[PDB]
């Protein structure tokens, strides 16, 4: 009984297939700390995964997709090395963990031809227009905030560690009031609200590179300049507000950005299409 | 009265092209609020841009290359809108700053043609064998530190505001050594040499979300996990160091990774190959 987890077009997903990876997950998850969904939905996920792998792996079988031997060969030896292992000695580590050479070899090629016909197909799907590139590049210029030295002030409206939305909405709205009346000094308003060590000192954090800022701030100061007031940004400790005080590689950064931004969209899209336009029967 | 800035294959950059682009540059620098180098090396920058612009552009013609009349106009609309103006409003800005709209429109089509050619030509060069899309994919597996929880300790080594080679070297030296002893307690080395406040509490620094950390740590953290030592990293205050304490669509990340690094790598490669395959004399 090759118990069948499900049917994808003119082929199947087994319980073997599922009950297998379904483990390698909980392993390579508790082997790197990150906890997991419900064993119920986790399955449902591993299902969706395995189904898709089929559609597109069939799509593979349909089109003339082989993967050369030298190629697969190289491919393994390079993750052998990567996780701190070796050639023949690889064999006797998963062969010593439940598997064979061919539970991996044939199993990796499946990964490889899947990667192939999945890119190869969303590749033919993306088209960047000069307009898009030009337009974007002109904007990534307005942002030109690289190692952009930057003085700024700070207002903290702090929340407790784990508040309800009743404790949050007060700070949330209270900020936007200060946000507006800041634009109509901040330094005075900082002492009158801010709850950090540099609060009574007027929110004054001082000069400092945009890099040295907490990542989440650098995401919103990127598009701003002298006088600007960004926020209110919510983090671990509550809502922050900031007042700003001072300050042919764009035709590439633009393109790399689109050629990427687009591929990520026009792949999510390409499966939405393959999934919904195929035979997906699931046997409980 | 209009000289030749430079011959560049049988065709020229003009002193006018340059002294007009130096106008387009310091026009931004005052508004963008960033200083420029010596007007002497700066001319030698713009010169070098305009030279390159040319080598490419001559390729523009060499192989026929248009720009959709509609695209050109569109980008310009899109660049107008991106700056909070209509064409009608922008028009006046072109007049007030002093440029013929059609000098400008044609000036853009210049930019657009160049891009067309650089990109079209770099994309040509990029070759991604699967043997490497796999390997890399199975390297970002044990890495995906997205909105991760993360507890750290932290040494800091002291460095004055404007440091001296000796200090800086003898500092990084001590900072390396601490790290060399760090992979052999860390908290007890806080107390030893950490310049910072937390040192007594052990550099003990608590749970941070990777994104809430300073962006100049993030770079070297996503590729590391519990029990690891990071840095020494250079910053304003000086040299940091830190312990860690707690914590397909990766073939998407994987491909994008390459599709991207390979472009950036192979543009920079082709550029230098074109300034090579080229007569070019500058006439100051």
């Amino acid at each position: 009984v090759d118990k069948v987890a499900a049917v994808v077009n003119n082929g199947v997903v087994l319980e073997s297939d599922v009950d297998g990876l379904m483990q390698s997950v909980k392993l390579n998850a508790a082997q790197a700390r990150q906890q997991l969904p419900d064993d119920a939905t986790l399955r449902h996920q591993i299902m969706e995964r395995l189904i898709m792998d089929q559609i597109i792996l069939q799509m593979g079988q349909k089109m003339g997709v082989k993967i050369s031997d030298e190629q697969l060969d190289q491919a393994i030896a390079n993750i052998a090395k990567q996780n701190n292992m070796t050639l023949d000695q690889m064999r006797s580590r998963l062969a010593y963990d439940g598997l064979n050479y061919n539970t991996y070899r044939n199993q990796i090629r499946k990964e490889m031809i899947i990667s192939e016909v999945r890119n190869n197909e969303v590749r033919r799907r993306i088209t960047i227009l000069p307009q898009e590139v030009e337009s974007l590049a002109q904007q990534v210029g307005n942002q030109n905030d690289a190692s952009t030295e930057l003085n700024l002030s700070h207002i903290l409206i702090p929340l407790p560690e784990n508040p309800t939305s009743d404790q949050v909405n007060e700070a949330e709205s209270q900020a936007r009031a200060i946000v507006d009346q800041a634009r109509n000094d901040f330094g005075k308003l900082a002492i009158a609200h801010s709850a950090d060590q540099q609060a009574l000192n007027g929110g004054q954090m001082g000069w400092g590179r945009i890099q040295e800022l907490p990542g989440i701030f650098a995401q919103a100061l990127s598009t701003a300049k002298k006088g600007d007031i960004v926020g209110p940004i919510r983090s671990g400790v509550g809502f922050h507000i900031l007042k700003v005080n001072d300050l042919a590689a764009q035709k590439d950064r633009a393109y790399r950005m689109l050629m990427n931004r687009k591929f990520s969209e026009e792949a999510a899209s390409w499966m939405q299409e393959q999934r919904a336009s195929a035979y997906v029967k699931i046997l409980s | 009265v209009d000289k030749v800035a430079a011959v560049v294959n049988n065709g020229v950059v003009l002193e006018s092209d340059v002294d007009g682009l130096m106008q387009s540059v310091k026009l931004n620098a005052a508004q963008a609020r960033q200083q420029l180098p010596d007007d002497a090396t700066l001319r030698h920058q713009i010169m070098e841009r305009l030279i390159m612009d040319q080598i490419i552009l001559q390729m523009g013609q060499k192989m026929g290359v248009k720009i959709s009349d509609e695209q050109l106009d569109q980008a310009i609309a899109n660049i107008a809108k991106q700056n909070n103006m209509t064409l009608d409003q922008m028009r006046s800005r072109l007049a007030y700053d002093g440029l013929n709209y059609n000098t400008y429109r044609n000036q853009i089509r210049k930019e657009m043609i160049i891009s067309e050619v650089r990109n079209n030509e770099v994309r040509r060069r990029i070759t991604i064998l699967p043997q490497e899309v796999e390997s890399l994919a199975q390297q970002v597996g044990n890495q995906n530190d997205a909105s991760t929880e993360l507890n750290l300790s932290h040494i800091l080594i002291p460095l004055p505001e404007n440091p001296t080679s000796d200090q800086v070297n003898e500092a990084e030296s001590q900072a390396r050594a601490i790290v060399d002893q760090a992979r052999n307690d860390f908290g007890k080395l806080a107390i030893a040499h950490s310049a910072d406040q937390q040192a007594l509490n052990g550099g003990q620094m608590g749970w941070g979300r990777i994104q809430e950390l300073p962006g100049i740590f993030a770079q070297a953290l996503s590729t590391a996990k519990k029990g690891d030592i990071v840095g020494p990293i250079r910053s304003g205050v000086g040299f940091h160091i830190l312990k860690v304490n707690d914590l397909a669509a990766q073939k998407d990340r994987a491909y994008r990774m390459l599709m991207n690094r390979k472009f950036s790598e192979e543009a920079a490669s082709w550029m230098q190959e074109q300034r090579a395959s080229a007569y070019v004399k500058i006439l100051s």
């Binding site: 954090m205 000069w207 | 300073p214 100049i216």
Partner: peptide, 10 residues
């Protein structure tokens, strides 16, 4: 410059 002053909020 402030890298720290600031980190010491998170």
């Amino acid at each position: 410059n402030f890298t720290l002053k600031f980190w010491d909020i998170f």
